[PDB]
Design a protein around this motif. Structure first.
Motif, PDB file in Angstrom:
ATOM      1  N   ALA A   1       0.842  -1.222   0.000  1.00 18.40           N
ATOM      2  CA  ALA A   1       0.000   0.000   0.000  1.00 18.40           C
ATOM      3  C   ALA A   1       0.868   1.260   0.000  1.00 18.40           C
ATOM      4  N   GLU A   2       2.192   1.126   0.126  1.00 22.12           N
ATOM      5  CA  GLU A   2       3.110   2.264   0.403  1.00 22.12           C
ATOM      6  C   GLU A   2       3.062   3.244  -0.763  1.00 22.12           C
ATOM      7  N   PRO A   3       2.997   4.564  -0.498  1.00 21.40           N
ATOM      8  CA  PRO A   3       2.995   5.552  -1.571  1.00 21.40           C
ATOM      9  C   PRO A   3       4.386   5.595  -2.194  1.00 21.40           C
ATOM     10  N   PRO A   4       4.542   6.072  -3.447  1.00 22.34           N
ATOM     11  CA  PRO A   4       5.870   6.223  -4.031  1.00 22.34           C
ATOM     12  C   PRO A   4       6.590   7.449  -3.450  1.00 22.34           C
ATOM     13  N   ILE A   5       7.890   7.566  -3.706  1.00 18.40           N
ATOM     14  CA  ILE A   5       8.687   8.789  -3.392  1.00 18.40           C
ATOM     15  C   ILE A   5       8.542   9.742  -4.587  1.00 18.40           C
ATOM     16  N   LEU A   6       8.018  10.949  -4.370  1.00 19.06           N
ATOM     17  CA  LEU A   6       7.835  11.959  -5.439  1.00 19.06           C
ATOM     18  C   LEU A   6       9.055  12.879  -5.418  1.00 19.06           C
ATOM     19  N   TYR A   7       9.296  13.579  -6.525  1.00 17.25           N
ATOM     20  CA  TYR A   7      10.338  14.627  -6.669  1.00 17.25           C
ATOM     21  C   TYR A   7       9.680  16.001  -6.510  1.00 17.25           C
ATOM     22  N   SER A   8      10.457  16.972  -6.025  1.00  8.44           N
ATOM     23  CA  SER A   8      10.119  18.420  -6.063  1.00  8.44           C
ATOM     24  C   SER A   8      10.269  18.923  -7.507  1.00  8.44           C
ATOM     25  N   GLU A   9       9.562  19.998  -7.879  1.00  8.95           N
ATOM     26  CA  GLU A   9       9.714  20.674  -9.196  1.00  8.95           C
ATOM     27  C   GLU A   9      11.212  20.807  -9.498  1.00  8.95           C
ATOM     28  N   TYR A  10      11.621  20.488 -10.732  1.00  6.83           N
ATOM     29  CA  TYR A  10      13.035  20.270 -11.142  1.00  6.83           C
ATOM     30  C   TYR A  10      13.643  21.583 -11.650  1.00  6.83           C
ATOM     31  N   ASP A  11      14.768  21.983 -11.044  1.00  4.98           N
ATOM     32  CA  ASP A  11      15.553  23.209 -11.358  1.00  4.98           C
ATOM     33  C   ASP A  11      14.706  24.454 -11.096  1.00  4.98           C
ATOM     34  N   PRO A  12      14.166  24.630  -9.865  1.00  2.45           N
ATOM     35  CA  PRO A  12      13.677  25.936  -9.425  1.00  2.45           C
ATOM     36  C   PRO A  12      14.877  26.872  -9.229  1.00  2.45           C
ATOM     37  N   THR A  13      14.656  28.188  -9.262  1.00  5.56           N
ATOM     38  CA  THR A  13      15.710  29.201  -8.983  1.00  5.56           C
ATOM     39  C   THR A  13      16.380  28.814  -7.658  1.00  5.56           C
ATOM     40  N   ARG A  14      17.694  28.566  -7.700  1.00  5.25           N
ATOM     41  CA  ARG A  14      18.539  28.207  -6.530  1.00  5.25           C
ATOM     42  C   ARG A  14      19.497  29.369  -6.286  1.00  5.25           C
ATOM     43  N   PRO A  15      19.547  29.991  -5.081  1.00  5.62           N
ATOM     44  CA  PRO A  15      18.912  29.484  -3.867  1.00  5.62           C
ATOM     45  C   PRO A  15      17.480  29.999  -3.670  1.00  5.62           C
ATOM     46  N   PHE A  16      16.810  29.558  -2.600  1.00  4.99           N
ATOM     47  CA  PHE A  16      15.401  29.925  -2.291  1.00  4.99           C
ATOM     48  C   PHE A  16      15.366  31.166  -1.394  1.00  4.99           C
ATOM     49  N   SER A  17      14.340  32.000  -1.601  1.00  2.47           N
ATOM     50  CA  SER A  17      13.720  32.873  -0.572  1.00  2.47           C
ATOM     51  C   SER A  17      12.601  32.076   0.117  1.00  2.47           C
ATOM     52  N   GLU A  18      12.166  32.541   1.292  1.00  2.00           N
ATOM     53  CA  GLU A  18      11.122  31.908   2.144  1.00  2.00           C
ATOM     54  C   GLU A  18       9.944  31.445   1.281  1.00  2.00           C
ATOM     55  N   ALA A  19       9.448  32.329   0.407  1.00  2.00           N
ATOM     56  CA  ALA A  19       8.228  32.128  -0.409  1.00  2.00           C
ATOM     57  C   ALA A  19       8.407  30.896  -1.298  1.00  2.00           C
ATOM     58  N   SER A  20       9.421  30.915  -2.166  1.00  2.00           N
ATOM     59  CA  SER A  20       9.675  29.873  -3.196  1.00  2.00           C
ATOM     60  C   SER A  20       9.924  28.522  -2.510  1.00  2.00           C
ATOM     61  N   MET A  21      10.695  28.494  -1.418  1.00  2.00           N
ATOM     62  CA  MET A  21      10.894  27.266  -0.597  1.00  2.00           C
ATOM     63  C   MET A  21       9.540  26.778  -0.058  1.00  2.00           C
ATOM     64  N   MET A  22       8.696  27.680   0.449  1.00  2.00           N
ATOM     65  CA  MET A  22       7.350  27.315   0.960  1.00  2.00           C
ATOM     66  C   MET A  22       6.453  26.870  -0.201  1.00  2.00           C
ATOM     67  N   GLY A  23       6.657  27.420  -1.404  1.00  2.00           N
ATOM     68  CA  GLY A  23       5.974  26.989  -2.642  1.00  2.00           C
ATOM     69  C   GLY A  23       6.370  25.579  -3.052  1.00  2.00           C
ATOM     70  N   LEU A  24       7.677  25.299  -3.092  1.00  2.00           N
ATOM     71  CA  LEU A  24       8.230  23.942  -3.364  1.00  2.00           C
ATOM     72  C   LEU A  24       7.624  22.921  -2.400  1.00  2.00           C
ATOM     73  N   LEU A  25       7.721  23.178  -1.094  1.00  2.00           N
ATOM     74  CA  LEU A  25       7.318  22.207  -0.037  1.00  2.00           C
ATOM     75  C   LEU A  25       5.805  21.963  -0.091  1.00  2.00           C
ATOM     76  N   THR A  26       5.017  23.027  -0.239  1.00  2.00           N
ATOM     77  CA  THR A  26       3.534  23.007  -0.394  1.00  2.00           C
ATOM     78  C   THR A  26       3.144  22.217  -1.650  1.00  2.00           C
ATOM     79  N   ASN A  27       3.711  22.577  -2.806  1.00  2.00           N
ATOM     80  CA  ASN A  27       3.544  21.832  -4.083  1.00  2.00           C
ATOM     81  C   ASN A  27       3.771  20.336  -3.819  1.00  2.00           C
ATOM     82  N   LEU A  28       4.822  19.989  -3.072  1.00  2.00           N
ATOM     83  CA  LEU A  28       5.240  18.585  -2.845  1.00  2.00           C
ATOM     84  C   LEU A  28       4.276  17.898  -1.883  1.00  2.00           C
ATOM     85  N   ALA A  29       3.915  18.569  -0.790  1.00  2.00           N
ATOM     86  CA  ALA A  29       3.051  17.972   0.243  1.00  2.00           C
ATOM     87  C   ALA A  29       1.673  17.724  -0.383  1.00  2.00           C
ATOM     88  N   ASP A  30       1.165  18.681  -1.159  1.00  2.00           N
ATOM     89  CA  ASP A  30      -0.140  18.602  -1.864  1.00  2.00           C
ATOM     90  C   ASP A  30      -0.154  17.443  -2.861  1.00  2.00           C
TER      91      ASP A  30
END
Ligand SMILES: C[C@@H]1Cc2c([nH]c3ccccc23)[C@@H](c2c(F)cc(NC3CN(CCCF)C3)cc2F)N1CC(F)(F)CO
Ligand SMILES: CC1=C(c2cccc(O)c2)[C@H](c2ccc(I)cc2)Oc2ccc(O)cc21
Lengths: 225, 234
Positions: free
Chosen positions: B17-46
């Protein structure tokens, strides 16, 4: 010493350190109800510190670590006490013998009804499980030692060994009560899973107290010695 | 159909029943500001959330529950489930959270969002506590199923008694499944009881981490709703 105790010895010592049941001073609405609950909380807090010092292992910890364990556990402890006292008053909370409060009387404080409801639900779960006063004292110790254990290494090993003997202690009570090994493992798990809900209730409590407008480290610091 | 299963059959199904391991959006602007990091993590958790519903419907006993009770358990558990998911896959990366195979962050990248670092340090301690205890996958899937079934059971007429006792019987079945895995591995009865207890006391810190997480997500300013979860459930 405290690592070399039997089930029987651990139970006895904890049955011995139990604080006494306290009295309130008692319509309401926000101010007085909070008043009565605050004051009673503050008096219970004084007895808590002297009870903690009597939990086997606790005093073998530094005063820094003793203080942290208490600043993280104090509201879980108050709450398991209330819930324990309420067990045979279905649909009420025995704050004190002269302050036995209805689900409906939570409405007198904004955000409190929800915390009464949580609490009443834990009480009913204790009643249905036939929780024993010997099981109660063990759980209240588990909470004390466990709610800030994850935050030096020597201290962590000591707390984890104490918690091992309380598991043994909890298993012994259930074997002596005549439970099968399957029934023992099951009841152990049922009681420790209720601690996650008590942790939950603690965190929503703390949150609701910051809507009211908590002890610092220095508070408990002085009170231990 | 969950009370028929042997220990091994309950473990088999939970692994499956185990869910797969998903990836975060590939090659976002590096490094992150608070917003974009919270966007990545939210996108991923959702995205992880969608797989969690599918996973939840394959936990034995969960679909026996009413849709209302099913969503109540997910409402109460979803962030504890994401968080235990994180700490498990982070185990073999000391001082690092493996959000995704392409999003591996140390404590200091946690400071790039105000309030995030405290919750970060907790997640890190828990993963270390898992490493220290040599948590096994068979055990992990038992703990993850316990969070789903336990977290919301305490905040539920004859109907919802049979739902509450059914949830408890399942939870009793997962306890037996955990003991069997320990006894199978060669632990003594005493060590079996000790290790069960330390695994379940860690669920109390995961609840703590979950409530601090929810506090933090609110502070910043959204999370799964009832209706949303009802929709994904059907
Ligand atoms: C209902 C719960 C649990 C509870 C309260 N009083 C009690 C007395 C004896 C046993 C248990 C309780 C009460 C309670 C309490 F638990 C603490 C306080 N606040 C005082 C603790 N004090 C220490 C710092 C003094 F400076 C502040 C006020 C309460 F109404 N509490 C409310 C809540 F905390 F969960 C917030 O909704
Ligand atoms: C634990 C965690 C988050 C986290 C980290 C620190 C604090 C916090 O509140 C959440 C953060 C998160 C961001 C937005 C939402 I909606 C939910 C989770 O991003 C994640 C992604 C995947 C995952 O498995 C766990 C998390």
């Amino acid at each position: 010493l405290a690592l070399s105790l039997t089930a029987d010895q651990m139970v006895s010592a904890l049955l011995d350190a139990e604080p006494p049941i306290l009295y309130s001073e008692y319509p309401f609405s926000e101010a007085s109800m909070m008043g009565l609950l605050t004051n009673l909380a503050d008096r219970e807090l004084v007895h808590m510190i002297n009870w903690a010092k009597r939990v086997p292992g606790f005093v073998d910890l530094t005063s820094h670590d003793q203080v942290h364990l208490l600043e993280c556990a104090w509201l879980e402890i108050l709450m398991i006490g209330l819930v324990w006292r309420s067990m045979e008053h279905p649909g009420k909370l025995l704050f004190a013998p002269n302050l036995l409060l209805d689900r409906n009387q939570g409405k007198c404080v904004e955000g409190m009804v929800e915390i009464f409801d949580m609490l009443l639900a834990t009480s009913s779960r204790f009643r249905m499980m036939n929780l024993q006063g010997e099981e109660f004292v063990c759980l209240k110790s588990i909470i004390l030692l466990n709610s800030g254990v994850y935050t030096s290494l020597e201290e962590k090993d000591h707390i984890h060994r104490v918690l091992d003997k309380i598991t043994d202690t909890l298993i012994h009570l259930m074997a002596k009560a005549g439970l099968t090994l399957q029934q023992q493992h099951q009841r152990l798990a049922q009681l420790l899973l209720i601690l996650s809900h008590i942790r939950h209730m603690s965190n929503k409590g703390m949150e609701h107290l910051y809507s009211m407008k908590v002890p610092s480290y220095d508070l408990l610091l002085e009170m231990l010695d």
